[PDB]
Amino acid sequence: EIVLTQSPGTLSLSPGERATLSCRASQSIGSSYLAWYQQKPGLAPRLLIYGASRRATGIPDKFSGSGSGADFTLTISRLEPEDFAVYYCQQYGSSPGTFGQGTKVEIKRTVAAPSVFIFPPSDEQLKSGTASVVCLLNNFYPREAKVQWKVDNALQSGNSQESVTEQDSKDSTYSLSSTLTLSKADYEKHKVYACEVTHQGLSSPVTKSFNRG
């Protein structure tokens, strides 16, 4: 069968630069049988180019395709944050055709410190018997960050979990949630709840806290 291999797997470039994406077929397929697609987060794929180099209706010239035989290239010029997407090649020399595995195009930016917020558990959840405490790290870059939870100035272990968004399509930053979960009984045993954040963009770690009640 025909297999398409895209390279690189991921590309991280600054706005204004040109991205060069490659697609190699395991046998010659011909330019007439290759197309390129963009898929942004949460959206359906969008046709960019067909026949290796023909732009689809309404597609701007920043997207350009070239190549022949088994080797094809897509260039994306004048990159912008909104170009963050996975780009796929497709061949339709077989029925059905096949897609490449995709190249993720990440838009680089400069270091940005997180804005940090802490949320107490809701009275509703507490009445039910559990306390979830949430620390938000908002709009930062790069992705690496350390969150430490302190309860009455005692470092916590084993009771927290993190989730991080993909890069934002407008400003290329990340956000992160850290959720500390305690039983109601344990929560009511302590007063001061704090999250302390370390990140490249902070001159010193930032702590946000609240007092129970």
Binding site: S32, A35, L47, Y50, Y88, V134, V164, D168, F210
Partner: protein, 214 residues
Amino acid sequence: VQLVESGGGLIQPGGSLRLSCAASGITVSSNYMSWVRQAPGKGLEWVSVMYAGGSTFYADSVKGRFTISRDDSKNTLFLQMNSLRAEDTAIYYCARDLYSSGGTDIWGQGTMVTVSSASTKGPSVFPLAPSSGGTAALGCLVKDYFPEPVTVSWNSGALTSGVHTFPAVLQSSGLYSLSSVVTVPSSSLGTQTYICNVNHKPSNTKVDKRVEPK
């Protein structure tokens, strides 16, 4: 020119499900039409095509279990999926292909198919409000649901700037949890109400939670 899909949902392994793709502005029977699916970590997988004349072709991964068909009078394309497997969990798209005359230019909106024997659980929604720099954050915690996905909006979709909805995490219980947050001016907190709207189609639930400062 649009393709509108329906029929997705949760189904147990070994079960069957039929997806529909109702076309407007193109005639299904005059076109190559396809189903393409997107599973976690599996990119796009082109699973079936039907030629204008009705010949059908399948990816090996679905051959013998899936059947593409069409109803010309309803101008609708179908995917009948039998003997479903966990590996078939994905967003399914229908699409119109032009092959060398134009690529795959028209895509449906996608419908989620989840193949699982685990029990369905609607989410619990709790407000994230500061205990209270000029900016405030508010949010909602969406706890212990199954299967994915939930859809979270703010103020019925009217508030989108500054919203971040985190990927769900699968807990040791087998249920998922996530939070959604938004940042707003601190000076706006006494001038209006912020509401998060959480929809979970598998449990047929729609929750609206006011997020009031404490």
